[PDB]
Every structure is written in C-alpha cells, then in structure tokens.
Design a binder for this molecule. Structure first.
Ligand SMILES: Cc1ncc(C[n+]2csc(CCOP(=O)(O)OP(=O)(O)O)c2C)c(N)n1
Ligand SMILES: Cc1ncc(C[n+]2csc(CCOP(=O)(O)OP(=O)(O)O)c2C)c(N)n1
Ligand SMILES: Cc1ncc(C[n+]2csc(CCOP(=O)(O)OP(=O)(O)O)c2C)c(N)n1
Ligand SMILES: [Ca+2]
Ligand SMILES: [Ca+2]
Ligand SMILES: [Ca+2]
Ligand SMILES: [Ca+2]
Ligand SMILES: [Ca+2]
Ligand SMILES: [Ca+2]
Ligand SMILES: [Ca+2]
Ligand SMILES: [Ca+2]
Ligand SMILES: [Ca+2]
Ligand SMILES: [Mg+2]
Ligand SMILES: [Mg+2]
Lengths: 524, 524, 524
C-alpha cells in the first residue's frame, strides 16, 4: 500500500470522511485519487476553511480534518486557530510541504521550521522524518486532537511522501481506541458529593466544555437536585444550559469584582467545564468574597493550574457531570424561580434596536434553531432574549477573534442539516471572513446570515468611552453594501430597514432552500 | 506582604520545604531571609542540583523545588531535565532573571527569551509580566508539575520582583487542591474488566508510573487474580513489581521484534504506566503477532497518542490499578511459576565479573535497599540478580542520559533515610556529575556509590561490535582514580580489586555513617 | 559516495580536522571509519566538550566542530552554549538522532523536537528531512557559524543517514567561500573619519570582537593617531588591547552611571566590537552625560538594535578597524600618559591575597602567556596586574556562566601550543567542569590551573553585603581537596599555602611538560 492509501484508510477507520481545504501544489499529491467516500469542502481563504471546520467539529462533537497550503495557507488560518484553541476544538490541521529533496535549498513553497509556525495555538505540531512515518504521525494527530482537553493539532507532510510505500505494520493504527472518559475516584468523588449535599446555598457555573460533552441534560438534573442557580461562565463560547430553565441566571459579566459579588452568599460554587474565569474587562477586586468556596471541574490541566482560587478536578466533563447528577441528594430547598421576561424596548418605524432583532428572531425561529454571535456590542441582550432549549444552540468566537461566526455557521449547518442556523454578525465582523459565503452557495448549505449594520465598530466605541479615550482612529466602517457582497458570492440577499421589513425578510429566509443574507439597519 | 513572603507561604502551604540549588546573583533576593523552616541543599553544578532534586521527588512521590542561576545555570541542568521529562518527575525549576530595568539592554546575567530555553523538556515554561503575578505563576508551576502526567516546569523571575508588594488576593492560592486522581468511567471500566476476565492467556507489562503511583501492590493483586506473567516495560526507569514474585518475568528487551515474540500467544496484554514502548535497539519486525490484543493504561496523552498499536486509556495509574485489582475475577488458572535462580558465573581471584558484584550486593544489602543503575553494559544482569521486594527500589536514567544516578542517589537517600541507597555506576558514567559527591559529604547523606571500573565505555564498545564499526574513537577512559576523586569531595573511599576485597568493602560501607565510594575493578 | 564520506570531505575542504566529542550510540555511525587525518578530542561531560571546543575556536579564530549525544548530551552542554553565544564563538554543534524509523515512537535516545532544544542559544538549528540533505545541512551549519556575527549552530542527524548514498551534486559544497569581510561604504566612512578627526577629546572603547578579529594592532594605531584613551568594554570576555600601552585605561565598571561618568568630557566615544553595554550591577543613571556622542561599530545587528544610545554601524570588525586605523589623521594632541603601576598589597607569610597571586604570575609567566579568568571576586585586580602585550591573551566566561575556564584553557592550550596557558579559577568555579582535567592529562595538553581557594562563593558573599541581604544559604563550599581531584584525573598537583610556596609551585608548573594544578590558599 502507498502512504496515501494507508492514510486515507486510517482516516476512514477513525471516523473521518470530510476534508475542509484550500488546495495548493504541495497538497495535490495528497488530494489526488481522492476517495469516493470522502467529501471535500472548499473555501476561498484559510481562515474560512478553518472556521467552517471548527463549526463542524464543535457541532458534531468529533474531530474535523483540514488541509491547507504550506506556510502561507497555515498562516492565513492562525487567527482561526486562536479561537479553536480556546474552544477546545478537535481540529486536525494538515499542511503540505515541499518535496524532501527541495526543503534544504528553501525552494518556493517550503514551510520553514514548519512545526513552530502554529505554536503556541496547537496541542501538538510535527513534521515526520520519513514517508513511512506519515500514517503513524497522522494517528498521533487524530488522537492528540481528540483526547481531553481537545484542541487543534498540526501535521506538515512533504508532498513526495504520499506515493511512497507504507509500512505494512501501519495496519495496527487503524482501529486504535483511545479514551480519556475519566472521572474522579470513588473516595474523593464521595467527598465532593457530600460537600455539595451539605451546602446551604450552592451555585453552579457552566462553561463551553459542558456543551461540547453534551453534558447539558446532566447539569440540568444536577441543578434541579441541588436547587441551585446556574450561570454561564463569562465570555461564553457555547451555551451549556436551557436559557428558560427556572435555575438559569444568564451570562456572567466578565469581571473579577462583578463575579465575586454575584457569588456572594453562595457557600459552595461548583464550576464545570470552564476556565476560572475568562474575565475580559478590567474590574479589580476580590476573586471571591468571604464565605464562598469554589470547586472547579475542568477537562484541561492548564485551566486548573491558572485558576487564582478554588479546588480543581481535572477530568472528562461528560463523565463527571453524569456521575454528579446521579449521586447528589435531592435537596428539600425550593427550586429557584425563573428569570423574568426581558423588557420590550420601544421601537419606532425606523432603524432597528438590537433588542428588537433578537426578540423577533426568538419569535420566528424554530425551537431547535442554532445561533452564532459575532455582534460584539449586543451579546448581553442576545443572551437575555433567545430561548435556547437544546444543546448545541450557541457559538461565539472563543478567543474573541472576529472572523469565526460567518464560516463557522456554515460548518454548524453542515453538521446539523435539520436545525436552522442563524448567524448574527456585526457589519464590522462580517468582513473578516466574508469569502466564506461562497462555500454556503456552492454546497447549498442553508445558513441564514443576519448582518447587524450600524456603520461602526460599536464595541470599540463603547470601550473608548469607558476609557475616556479621545481621538481614536479607525472605529468607523461606513460604505459597505452587504447585499452586493452576498450577490458577489452567489447568496440570496435581503434588506431590513425597519421592523416590518425584518419580519418579511426573516419569513423569506426561514423558508428558503439556500443560504440567505439579511442586511439589517440597526441603531447607531 | 512582599512577593517573597507570599511566595514562601505558598510553597509551605503546598507542602514544599526544601530548595535544591546552586546560587547566583539574580537569586540572592529570593534566597535572602531564607525561612527557618526550609532546607537549602547546595550542589556544585546544576546537573547535580537537578539530579538530586529528581531522585528526591521520585522517591518522595511529591514535587521537588529547584533554584538555578539564569540561563547558564538552567543550561547546565538541561541534560538532567531530559531524564526528568521521561520519568514524569514533578520538578519545579526556578531561575532568576536580571532586574526588569536591565533586561532590555541584555545586561550580563539576562536570560534571553527565557521561557524558550528549557523547551521542549518542560510541561510549562514562563516568565511573569509583573512582580505581583509571581505568586500566581508559582502556583501554576506547582500544579503543572504535580498534575498527571507529572513533569518538570520552569519559572524565570526578575530579581527585583521579590521585594515588591504582593497582591493580597494571592491568599486564595495557598490552599488550592488540584486533583487528577481519575479513572475510567464505570461503563467502560466494566467492559475492560470483562475483557481481562475472558482472556485465556493474559500478560501484564508495567512501567515506571506504577512505581511513581505506589501502585505496585495493586498490580501484584491484579497479576495474582489474572494468574498472569508480569514484565517490566523496556528501558525501565523504575521497578514496578517484586522481582522474586512468581509472576515476574523481568525486563523486556528494548526491541520491536523481541517484544512481539515475547507476547506471542498472549491474547490480551495489559500495559500499565508505560509508554508503548520505549524501544532502543534497532530490531525491526511486527509490533504484535497475530492473536495478541494490547490495552494500555497511561497517565500521559503523549504516550497514548504515539503507541503504534493497541487501545489506550488516559488516567491516573494509582486509581486505575486499584480499581482493576479490586474488580477482576479470581481466575482458576494456575499461578505462574517463579523464574529460576540466576546462574553463578565462574569467578577467579582477579577482577570482578559484574554478575559477581550484583550477586554479592544481593547477598549483603538489606532487604529494603534502594538501587540506582548507571552501569550501562550490565543492566540485564542487574535486573536478574537483585531481589527488590519493595516499591521505590530501583532508578535508571529515564532518557538514557548519564549523570543521573550519582546525584539522584543522594536525593533518594535524603528522601528515604531509613533505606540504604546503593548506586551502581560505571567508570564512564561516574564523571558526568562527579561533583555531586560533595553534597553527600557536606550534608552527611550516607549513600553508597559502587563504581564499576573497567576502563571503557563498554556499552558503546558492544554496540560498535554489533554495527561492525571499526575505527571508532573516544571509547576508552583510562586513568581515573575514583578513590582520589572521592577524597577530593570528602567522601570515604574504598577499593575492591577482587571478591574478598569487595565483601570487605561492602561490609565497611554498609556500617558507615557517612557516604562511601567503592571503586571495583571489573572485567574488561 | 556515502553521506559519511561526503560529509567528512566537506569538513576537510572547509578546514575542519578536529572533532570535540563525547560519544553515544546515535553517533557511532558518524564516528566509525574516523578519517586518519582527523583528530578526536574526548571529554568526559558535554559542558567540558563544548568548553574545550570554545577555547579552541576563540584562540584559533576559526570554527570548532563538536559531536554530542542526542538530547541529554546536548542538554548537558547548554550552559556552555550560553557563554559561546555571548562570545560569538563559531561552534558547529552536531548531535546524533535515533534512526528515522524509530523517531515516531520516541524510542530511547530520540531527541524530541530537536531543533528547539538549544534555542535560543544558537544562530541556526536544524534536523534534515532526508539523508541526502545532510551534507548540505552541514554546509549551512559551517557557514552560519562562521559568518559575522559568529556564533554556535546546531545540527541533529538521524544515525541511519550516514551510510546512505550522497547526492553527487554535493560536490559543489566543498569549496564554497562565504565572506562577510565588509566595511562601511566610502561616503559614510569618510563622514565617520571626519567626525573622529574633528573630535576635541575622543575616547575609544573596545570589546571582545576586536580580539576575535585580531584587530588589536589596528586599534593600537587608531588610538595612537587619535591620541585617545582606550577602555575595555565591561564584562570583558577577551582582551582587545595591550594592557601597558600608554593609552590603556583598563576595564570599565559594568554600570550605567559609572560608565557615563567615565566618558564625561569626551565629546566622541568610539565603541568597537562590543555591545553597548554589557552592564551587570544595578547602577542607575544617565547612559551618557551631556556633551558625549557615542558611535558603535559592531559585527552584530542584535547589538546595534539594543544599544540605548548612539549611532551604530554593523560591519566586520577587522575590516572596519583596519580602514579606520589607516584613514584617520595623526592628531597633534599629546599621547595619553600610561597608567601608573599598581600598588603592592601588604602580604604576610600566611594565606595569599589575590593581588599577590596576580603580581607573582605577572613576574614569572612568559610574556606570551595566555590567561583565563574564572575567579569572580578578583577580576578587577587581575585586569590591573597582568601585562598582556599580545592578542589572544585573556578569556572570561562571556555570559558569566561558570564552568568555562577550566575546559576552555585546555582548548586554548591545544590551539596555541607555544603559548603557556594559565587558568586562574576560584574554588567554587573549579567544580562546574572539573572532569575536563582528564582531557588535559590524556592528551598531555600542558595547561596550568591555578585554583584560588578561599572556601566560599566570594563574589556572592560580596553582593549579599551590597544588598544588605541576611540569611542567604549556600554561599560556602568548604571541604574540597583540589590536589586529590587533580590526582583523580591524572594531573600533577601542587599546593601553595604562602608566597614562598606559590613561587616554588609556579616555577615547577612553568617547567612541567604536562598539565599542572596548583591549589593556592587565598584570603577569606
Ligand atoms: C481579528 C480581530 N480583529 C480585531 C478585533 C477587535 N474587535 C473587538 S469588537 C470589534 C468591533 C466589531 O464590530 P461589529 O462586528 O460591527 O459589532 P459591534 O461592536 O458594532 O456590535 C473589533 C474590531 C478582534 N476582536 N478580532
Ligand atoms: C550525557 C550522555 N552522554 C553520552 C552518552 C552515551 N553513553 C551510552 S552508554 C555510555 C558508556 C557508559 O560507560 P560506563 O558508565 O563506564 O558503563 P559501561 O557501558 O562500561 O557498563 C555512554 C557514554 C549518554 N547516554 N549520555
Ligand atoms: C553556572 C553558574 N552557576 C552559578 C553562578 C553564580 N556565581 C556567580 S560568581 C559565583 C561564585 C564563584 O566562586 P569562586 O569561583 O570560588 O570565586 P570567588 O567569587 O570566590 O572569587 C557563583 C556561584 C554562575 N555565574 N554560573
Ligand atoms: Ca416574544
Ligand atoms: Ca451531523
Ligand atoms: Ca457594527
Ligand atoms: Ca546469593
Ligand atoms: Ca521522606
Ligand atoms: Ca565502563
Ligand atoms: Ca612585578
Ligand atoms: Ca594553532
Ligand atoms: Ca572562592
Ligand atoms: Mg508560531
Ligand atoms: Mg530550548
């Protein structure tokens, strides 16, 4: 067998059947004789390739396989890798290298010092020392991406390796099963359970690894048993809990003082599947108020190590959430009361308040819709106004890096064909990965893109006001016609200049069989 | 509180009370006002510092704290870090940096790009961005070293940081408990147990992480229940099993073909706490013969990912070994028969055969002795001839890097004052870290050093013969007087030119109250 | 031709005929069939290997070739590389790697992520992607080490590559000549010369790259023409000027305020072949006083970039010094007056003051002696008391990293067999690379080692006093018998407890035909 044949068998045997890519010359020998049972999803720029793959992996809860061109292609994707690192996305990033005979002279297309290029944004990065090692290196990549804490990995392959003979002993790679589905030993788990049962006013904080693990339902049972309020950890990349469940308390503000105040009076705070904490704004104060003990369950040693407070347990979130949900006592305390309905913001017949947009989406979208957020000034309102009952219903750039949501919404839609995906994206954010739209058109992936157009980088204008910063350049982005951009990449385009048009446009988008972009005129 | 005071409180609160070090100017502000409840162990070169700390950590089964001088001191220790990485040794390596005001100009003693210096031999490497971050960075270092898979970490601290005010919120660091004591979820554990119970001819292979976890006794119960032979995984850094237990089958040869042949006929091979496998010699062939399934339990994702065959589970070795030992059925098969006694090699009244040395050590040493091996051509015979009943009884440079055993034997002896440590070290190996002897003298740490002196790099001569390599320079090391070197560093010195003198010397060494070096004239 | 044959031809053709090494298994296939016209110099630990090679390269003013064993051997040498980086030493560091077929599984002796190991202490670091690339990679290593600014490089080679067929086109590598012998263009050079000619009170500061370039005599002519005082830049690794020339003003103190004060009143300060500046102690103040302009000529962009003041020119020091010396006008100012003779410190019949030692060395040593300094508390006195008329007469660990001088003195002596080398080394420093003594004995390299024994890390005690630091552990090193250590490695040993014995011992050492160590009892 060739290295090419053995590697594709490995991938198939390990459950991979889709390649997200932008091709180049170093990759043609890998991509040739492309197996009939595999799918290739082309995107026009590598941030888009990786974004699409990322959404696909996150939604599918399985690794996604990527093929990029050498250093320039990998480099174009590195902002996308920043997000993937923070979301623990299992991405197998492969890139082609020059033929081994031309690496030394640094011929054009040579990826110099290749394994260092994507660092520090990958779990593992490697270029094999021989062609026969490639299948083994690919196996390592698959498992490194897939083991807890999941994350992106990188493999560079000289293009002449593919046609070489594989090692017959590579067959032992095909069916390897590697598990990290582990939980705290029984003795120490019993101690934890007793601490939760004995708490007088527990609280629960959930992060993205709960949704990644599909531990949402177990966390609901845990919160109902403990009669505890539930918050989503700050800067949330995913939604880990039904947002109209009586226990839900919403998104935590991303500040030290604000979180310790929220937790005041709670004697035990159990954090699951989140860093402690992904703060953002400067908000100095106490990490915890006196009287609060924090206990973190994380899939990631790096999270456990950097938490400035609390005990931690490093384990699989699915295994731990299931165990905890089934072991804790049913408290006789009263179940928390559901959050009140959000207020309706006054809306005239002119430009749309973002609150209006979210309320209308929540009114019209199916109950199993999936939302993506890259409307950076409106996140708090979005979290308050969308009823997200199901797992896998929300994604936000986990490193704050713009250019995620537009391609990721395509990948999510590919992963979940029966769930309408709706990406809510600011006019600023929409540009970073605008060319991703083409992939939705070409493959007829019926994502809905809602562009919130207020002509400015609104979150930056706001922060400049907080800083009392004057004379800041580059905050406005006037003069972008998003309907024309949609037409440019073959996506049906609609406008909404007022509420009546928003409703009409959303009705048309929801029934459409292809992707749709709606340009919404929002308040400045 | 100062950064100095807060950091030492953190260390004390986290169980650290000993600093292994070689001082320098960037470190004086850390070392001043040294707490009265801490111990400083000086060594004369940094390979020795780290070696001593490594032995201490491995034997104590807890982190060891190190302080080195900037780049040159760290660099002198990097061979020692190569071994520590492979043995999963929890070492907290700190190094002082220039004052922040002098870093830019690269004043003498500036550690340039400091965090990159020890890579790739550390789990985590960091220089804090401010003085008030130092306690938090130290906390990260402690936990990163201590979480599974354990390993060395590195922290560089500008010397002016120590006197600065600490953040009062650093108090939340002091009592953090971080656990990775996890095991496979119940459903999948039951599947594994059923596979072991249903095996017709199981075998067990154990590596160093069993001894590190003190899982030895649980593995004995597991092997007795399964009626299975037990091997030690190749290139063994530690001894995970009683070497005269009826199930013990010794050290596996470090070759692909040799191991698959040994495992032939065994339908299930359970590997615990080892890489799959730390091969050494070129010995191409099948990774496994038809009919053998391999299952690996490892504490290290990197091990699980690179295994070329078998299923893997990433979990704590102590937790998994205890669970497996208590869940498997008692097989009705006959218990394996103990290995026969080793042959007595003919010995005249002249230079000593290594077999003779090991037999005599085994005859005279206490049953709870601890051995270290850095006699590279005699390892197989050592493993056959020493009855090691207890955990923590054997150490060998885990990366094959010479210069470990002499300092590590001092650290092991410090960790286990009631257990006589005996380091068996070749004349070649003894030089790498010879100055470590001084620490044993100064602190009166009564390690016994047995120098196997045959005048040559014997393992290299042997391999040159295997390669049929002629005209290889640098293989002989004549003209070293080890008694004179011992006197140089204040260690009592004895000679053994024949068996009678070996017995006499060992009797004197075993009764001595200080360290002793015995120079043994072994066969060329 | 094999890769082995082609590589050794390349080395020979490029002027390399000596391998400094400590062997291992990954290196035997390189070292076998060792050419009859090459020399192998064995040392017992890799800090010693590299130190010896470094001294050889610095003194010979040509690259030195090193062969180390994989990661552990390379790691043991990294403190030595810290010094080599700072001294711009052209060192070609090669290390053997596992056979390509065993790299993936990380067999014992695999150097993982090899090219990252010695970073950031090398100019270039690389592992070739195929066997046929090895000669080309070796060529790159040779030239990268040798081009200005010179420095260490690293090459890792899988051991199976050596026996493979080489590319016949590798013959184009053999006779490549690569020059960096460049100087400032004529127009800008004329501007510089006019600035020097028009200065009313110029000063000159010289660093180690002057001695490396053998630009010493040109700098003498330059200083005589400009009638300018000459200082050696701080933390001096080499001596760039005759120390009894009337213009010489000695070693600059390594402090910001102290240097700007020394330069006050000098309208133009020309720095050649030094960083601006290798400060050490904290001595805040002005980089330059008003009225002083600084101009730096450096071979190193990194030096030019980080200088906090002055203009800079990046060029070859030899070419620039020769051009400047021959272009500047002869000033009619009076030649500076020679520094006065140093004072004779009172000396009783007891332990030796370091001043006494240096005065006696200067009285008895040949005029073409070469000195090395690793007596860290006595450097200022050494620089005042030794008349060093010739180039290549002084070496001091360029990064301050101890363990340089003892092995480097052996390498210097090998490079300069007609020049008596005298290494003056503190009792603390002597231990770091003590095993290097064996190489001097085995090869009969007649270096003289003068051990200044005061029982303590005196420079650290002094600095602790400056800091007013109490309770600093680890500052004393009692109980080392250096005569016994010398005997241990086969080096003739002498003692000097008083001045009469010092003179007697030095007379015997100077006439000896082998290496000699003198243990001198110096004042505490
Ligand atoms: C790749 C990248 N570049 C720059 C930023 C900085 N960024 C933070 S929010 C913001 C404005 C985004 O504007 P828009 O999408 O229109 O949303 P709005 O803030 O107006 O709601 C920008 C540019 C970023 N996070 N990522
Ligand atoms: C730091 C380091 N340098 C070099 C080697 C290569 N090495 C492998 S075994 C060997 C010989 C050791 O000789 P000795 O300790 O006398 O034992 P013997 O082989 O004679 O039993 C050497 C140098 C190594 N493993 N580590
Ligand atoms: C590898 C290394 N480790 C530690 C130091 C810190 N160091 C600075 S000077 C000094 C003392 C050296 O003592 P000695 O050689 O006896 O000379 P003295 O200071 O007594 O003159 C030490 C350990 C260093 N520079 N390099
Ligand atoms: Ca509504
Ligand atoms: Ca799907
Ligand atoms: Ca906007
Ligand atoms: Ca016996
Ligand atoms: Ca103990
Ligand atoms: Ca030997
Ligand atoms: Ca005199
Ligand atoms: Ca010469
Ligand atoms: Ca001293
Ligand atoms: Mg990078
Ligand atoms: Mg490094």
């Amino acid at each position: 067998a060739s290295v090419h044949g053995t590697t594709y068998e490995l991938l198939r045997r390990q459950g991979i059947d889709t390649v997200f890519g932008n091709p180049g010359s170093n990759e043609l020998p890998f991509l040739k004789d492309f197996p009939e049972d595999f799918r290739y999803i082309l995107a026009l720029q590598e941030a888009c390739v990786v974004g699409i793959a990322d959404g696909y992996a996150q939604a599918s809860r399985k690794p996604a396989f990527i093929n990029l061109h050498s250093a320039a292609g990998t480099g174009n994707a590195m902002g996308a890798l920043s997000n993937a690192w923070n979301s623990h996305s299992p991405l197998i990033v492969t890139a082609g290298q020059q033929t081994r005979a031309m690496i030394g002279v640094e011929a054009l297309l040579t990826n110099v010092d290749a394994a260092n290029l994507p660092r520090p944004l990958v779990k593992w990065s490697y270029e094999p020392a021989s062609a026969a090692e490639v299948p083994h290196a690919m196996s390592r990549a698959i498992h490194m991406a897939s083991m807890a804490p999941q994350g992106p990995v990188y493999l560079s392959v000289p293009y002449d390796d593919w046609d070489k003979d594989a090692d017959p002993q590579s067959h032992h790679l095909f069916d390897r099963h590697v598990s990290s589905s582990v939980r705290l030993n029984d003795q120490d788990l019993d101690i934890l359970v007793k601490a939760l049962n004995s708490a007088s006013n527990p609280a629960i904080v959930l992060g993205p690894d709960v949704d990644a693990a599909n531990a949402n339902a177990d966390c609901v049972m845990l919160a109902e048993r403990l009669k505890a309020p539930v918050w989503v950890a700050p800067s949330a990349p995913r939604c880990p809990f039904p947002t109209r469940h009586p226990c839900f308390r919403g998104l935590m503000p991303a500040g030290i003082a604000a979180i310790s105040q929220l937790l005041e009076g709670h004697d035990v705070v159990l954090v699951i599947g989140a860093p402690v904490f992904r703060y953002h704004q400067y908000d100095p104060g106490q990490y915890l108020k006196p009287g609060t003990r924090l206990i973190s369950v994380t899939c990631d040693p790096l999270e456990a190590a950097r938490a400035p407070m609390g005990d931690a347990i490093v384990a699989d979130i699915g295994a731990m959430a299931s165990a905890l949900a089934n072991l804790v006592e049913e408290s006789s305390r009263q179940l928390p009361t559901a959050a009140p309905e959000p207020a309706k913001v006054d809306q005239d017949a002119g430009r749309l308040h973002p609150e209006t947009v979210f309320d209308t989406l929540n009114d019209m979208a199916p109950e199993n819709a999936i939302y993506l957020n890259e409307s950076t000034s409106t996140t708090a309102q979005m979290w308050q106004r969308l009823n997200m009952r199901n797992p896998g219903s929300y994604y936000f750039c986990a490193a704050g890096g713009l250019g995620f949501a537009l391609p990721a919404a395509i990948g999510v839609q590919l992963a979940e064909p029966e769930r309408q995906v709706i990406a809510v994206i600011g006019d600023g954010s929409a540009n970073y990965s605008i060319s991703a739209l083409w992939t939705a058109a070409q493959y007829n992936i019926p994502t809905i893109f809602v562009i919130m157009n207020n002509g400015t980088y609104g979150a930056l204008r706001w922060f400049a006001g907080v800083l009392e910063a004057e004379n800041v350049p580059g905050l406005d982005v006037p003069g972008i016609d998003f309907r024309a951009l949609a037409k440019g990449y073959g996506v049906q385009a609609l406008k909404a200049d007022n509420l009546e048009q928003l409703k009409g446009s959303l009705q048309e988008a929801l029934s459409a069989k292809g992707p749709v972009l709606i340009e919404v005129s929002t308040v400045s």
